[model samples]
Target chain A: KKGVVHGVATVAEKTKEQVTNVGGAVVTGVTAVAQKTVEGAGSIAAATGFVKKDQ
Target chain B: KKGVVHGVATVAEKTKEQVTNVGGAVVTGVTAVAQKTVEGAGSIAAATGFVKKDQ
Candidate 1:
C-alpha cells in the first residue's frame, strides 16, 4: 500500500512535466489525460482507505 | 526538437507508471489515455522531424 501510493505520486509528477513540453492540440490531449490521471489517482487513493483525517 | 523529444519520452514513462497504479475501470480509462499520449507524442515527434535516420 505504501509503495502503491508513492508510485502514484511519482508518476503523476512525471506526467505533469511531460505535458508541459507540448503545444496546441498535443497539449490539449495530454492535458485532458493528465487531469484524468490525477482524478483517477485521487479516487484510487481514497478507495484504498489509505488517507486519514487529522485529529 | 531535442527538448521536445526528450519531453515526450519523460511524459510517456510517467504515464506508463501511473497507469500501473490503478485497477479495474480506472485502469481501462488510464490505459486508453496513456496509449493516446504515446500516439500523440509520436505524431508530434515525427511532425517535427526530430528523429532522423542514422547514416
Candidate 2:
C-alpha cells in the first residue's frame, strides 16, 4: 500500500532547508524535527511492508 | 518580539491531531515528528527573543 510517508518526508526536508536559511536556533531545532520526520517516513515504510523495520 | 514559534506550535498541534486520526503506523511516526516540531518552535522562540530559553 502506497502511503503518505514519501510525501511527508519530502515536505519535511524542504522545510528543513528553509529552516537552515532562517539561521541561529531555528536551524538547530528544525534539524532535529526534520530528522524525526525522516525516521517517521522509515517507520511508515516498514508498517506498509515497503521495507523491513531494521532498514 | 513576536516570533514564529506560537504560530508553528499551533500548526504542529493541528498536524498532530490529523496524524492521530490517520491511525496505526502513521500516528507513531508523525507523533515523534510533531513533538520535535514543538521543540523547534521553542528554539525559535528563543532566537526571536519572544520568550526566555528556560520557559
Candidate 3:
C-alpha cells in the first residue's frame, strides 16, 4: 500500500499537465487536479487520449 | 462508491494488457483495458500524439 501511493505520486503531476493541455480536468491523482477554470472552454483533457496527432 | 471501484477493477486489468502491449506503464484503472500479458516490448507508454502541423 505504501509503495502504491508512492508510485502513483510519481507520475501524477505529469499526467495533470498532459490532461490540462488537452483541455481535460484531472479527475484522479494525488496532486490537485488542474481544472480549465474557464467558463465553457470544454474538454480539459484531450478526448482522444493523444496530446498530439498527425492527420 | 463501492460500486464504482468494483466496476473499475474489471476494466483495469483489460486496460493494463492494452498498455503493456503498447509499451505503456499502467497509470490508473481497476480492470485492465485484454491482458495479453506479453512480456518484453518497447513502449511502456505510447507517445503517439501527432500535432499534425502543416506537412
Candidate 4:
C-alpha cells in the first residue's frame, strides 16, 4: 500500500533526499512515530510534522 | 529573550502526542488565517492530523 502523502513520506517508498527534492517535508521517522500519539484533530494532527517550508 | 530554547521548545513542544492531539491544536493569535495551497505549508496546513505508525 502506498499511503505516503504530504508532510511526511515513507522511508520505504522515497528516501529523505528524494522527498525533499520534490518539495516534500522531511521529518524523522522517530518524530513521525511520536506525532501519532496526541489526541484530537484525529488524523490530521498525526499527519503533520512541522512540514518544511524551506526544503 | 533566547531563541535557542525557543527552538528547542518549539522542537520539544512538538511531541508526537502533542502534535497528534489535534483537539488541542488551536492557534488563535496569528495562525488563524488560511492560505490553502500545496506549497508554503499553509497556516500549519490548517488540518494535518493524519498519523503514521503506532500511537
Candidate 5:
C-alpha cells in the first residue's frame, strides 16, 4: 500500500511539473514570435512611409 | 494491490487529459490573439498607406 501510494504521488507530481514547464515554454515561444512580428511590421510600415522612423 | 494500481493509473490518465486540454486551449488562445494582431496591424498599415488595400 505504501509503495502504491508513493507511486501515484510521484506520477502526479511529475505530471504537474511537466504541464507547468510546457505552459511556460509555450508562452515564451509565443511571446518571442509576437514581438518579432510586431517589430517586422513596424519596420515595413516605416519604410513605406506609413509610420515615422523611430529615433 | 489492485486498488493501488488502479488509483495510480487513473491519476496518470487524468493528468494526461488535463495537460492535453490545457495545451489545446493555450494554442487556441494564442492563435486567436496572433490573428487579431496581424489583422489590426494590416488595417493600420493600409490606412497609413503602408500596404495596398486588399481587394
Candidate 6:
C-alpha cells in the first residue's frame, strides 16, 4: 500500500503544479486584455479629434 | 470620428478572439488533468494490491 500512497501523492503534486501554471496563464491573458483596452481607448480618442494638448 | 469608431471596433474584435483562445487553452489543460487523475487512481489501486481479477 505504500507504493499506492506514494503514487497518489505524486499525482496530487503534479496536479497542483498544473493548476499554478493555469493560474499564471489566466493572469497573463487578463493583463494583456487590460493593456489593450487602455491603448485602444487612447487611439479612439485621438482618431475622434478629442485629444487634449498640454499648455 | 469614424476612424476612432473603426479602431475601437477592431480592438474589441481582437480582444474577443483572444478570450476565445484562452478559453480553449483552459479547457484543454483541464481535460488533460482529468485524464491524468483517472490513470493515476488506477495505478495507485493496482500498486496497493487492491485490484480485482475477473472470474
> Evaluated with lDDT, which candidate comes out highest?
5
Residue pairs in candidate 5 whose N, alpha carbon or C atoms collide under 3 angstroms? none
DockQ for each numbered candidate: 0.05, 0.04, 0.04, 0.04, 0.11, 0.01
Q: Which portions of model 4 miss their true places by more than 4 Å?
A: A1-22, A32-45, A50-55, B1-55
- Top candidate on DockQ is 5
Candidate 4 local lDDT, B1-55, one digit each (tens): 1222211121222223222112122211222223322333222233443322332
Candidate 4 lDDT over residue span A1-55, tens digit each? 2232333221232222222222333343332122222333322332333332222
- Per-residue lDDT tens digits of candidate 1, residues B1-55? 1222211232234353332222112112212222211222122211111222224
Highest TM-score scorer:
5
Candidate 5 lDDT tens digits, B1-55: 2336532233443343222221112221222122222323333422212323333
lDDT-sorted candidate list, best first? 5, 4, 3, 1, 2, 6
**What tens-digit string does per-residue lDDT give for candidate 3 at A1-55?**
1122211112121122221112332333232222332222222232212333325
Error of 4 at A8 (Å): 20
Q: Clashes in candidate 2: how many?
A: 0
Give the proportion of true interface contacts each model preserves, from 0 to 1: 0.05, 0.02, 0.04, 0.03, 0.13, 0.00
- lDDT of candidate 3 vs native? 0.24
Ranking by TM-score: 5, 3, 4, 1, 2, 6
> Tens digit of lDDT per residue, candidate 6, span B4-42?
221111122212122212111222221111111122212
Instruction: Give the docking tier of candidate 3.
Output: incorrect
Q: Comparing 4 and 6 by lDDT, which wins?
A: 4
**lDDT of predicted model 1:** 0.23
TM-score, cand. 2: 0.14
Off by over 4 Å in 6: A1-10, A14-16, A20-30, A35-55, B1-23, B27-55
Model 6 clashing residue pairs (backbone) = none
